[PDB]
Design a binder for this molecule. Structure first.
Ligand code: SAH
Ligand code: SAH
Lengths: 156, 156
């Protein structure tokens, strides 16, 4: 129902789990280059992924290009530096949820230009540093989908 | 705040992500043997895990042993065969959330003896088969923690 954006993702396995997640939820995936792997990389193919789970994915050469072609109504940045928690905001159609790379998170140059209410954190206990990227995306996507009533889900 | 139970988990990487998840959330982890890896396996150590993230983990030789030593107040089984969704139930202290193996899910012999209201599914779109185990656990744990007010979380 919403759009998920990975800013310069590095590890193919995480992205593979995220593509499966987006196909299982109906969320659309955007990737902002440079990526840490070839798009034709095995770690997304031999991985167990179905080719139909791809192609609904948009790749953007730069962040600027992404903003200019998508014109997100609202852009959220998931960052352990955020103040409101992911479940304390009210998602709406038109929202884009952006995540940073596994080894460094979203650039301060980008975060600096975003409103405080749109930089959100997933809660963690003391001395936690961050969570695995694919797990962060799963938690965020499912919290948004829960708020939006799980439109599109079907019983098996 | 709650207890997470992995029934015969097979792949070390998933369990590694789950141990990091439980340490980041304060949830307690239980593993029901046989596991698919040695407890002394590298895929949980060279993985980037901190030894303190372990030892709060309980290993059980059998499911029966687990029931007899833990006496869960309520035991939930996460299964794509469940009717209520994970966010449609009201978690409470004392709950144990159980997940099945990556290649087969929880045995019907166990599911058959559980009440319908305690076999829960995470929603998915048409023709979805299941989600990655560590992602399923993350989504469930964070939904429960959200309901319980994120007790124990701290801002970084
Ligand atoms: N607790 C949390 N809250 C919000 N986003 C999180 C998160 N844990 C991981 N993420 C997301 O997962 C991405 C990859 S984890 C990146 C490492 C992190 N920047 C660090 O300095 O340790 C992050 O950029 C973010 O989008
Ligand atoms: N949509 C969903 N709802 C509930 N639990 C799920 C799930 N997707 C994965 N899981 C959990 O992740 C575990 C490993 S996935 C296991 C494969 C699945 N039994 C199959 O037949 O395809 C499952 O046993 C369950 O505990």
């Amino acid at each position: 129902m919403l759009d998920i954006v990975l800013y310069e993702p590095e590890i193919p396995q995480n992205t593979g789990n995220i593509i499966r997640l987006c196909a299982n939820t109906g969320f659309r995936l955007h990737l902002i280059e440079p990526l840490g792997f070839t798009w034709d990389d095995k770690r997304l193919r031999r991985s167990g992924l179905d080719y139909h789970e791809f192609a609904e994915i948009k790749r953007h050469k730069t962040f600027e290009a992404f903003l200019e072609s998508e014109k997100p109504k609202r852009l959220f940045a998931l960052t352990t530096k955020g103040c409101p928690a992911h479940s304390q905001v009210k998602f709406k159609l038109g929202d884009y949820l952006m995540f940073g790379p596994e080894t460094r998170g979203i650039p301060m140059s980008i975060l600096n230009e975003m409103p405080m209410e749109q930089k959100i954190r997933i809660p963690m206990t003391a001395n936690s540093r961050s969570m695995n990227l694919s797990n962060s995306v799963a938690v965020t996507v499912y919290e948004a989908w829960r708020q939006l009533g799980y439109k599109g889900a079907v019983n098996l």
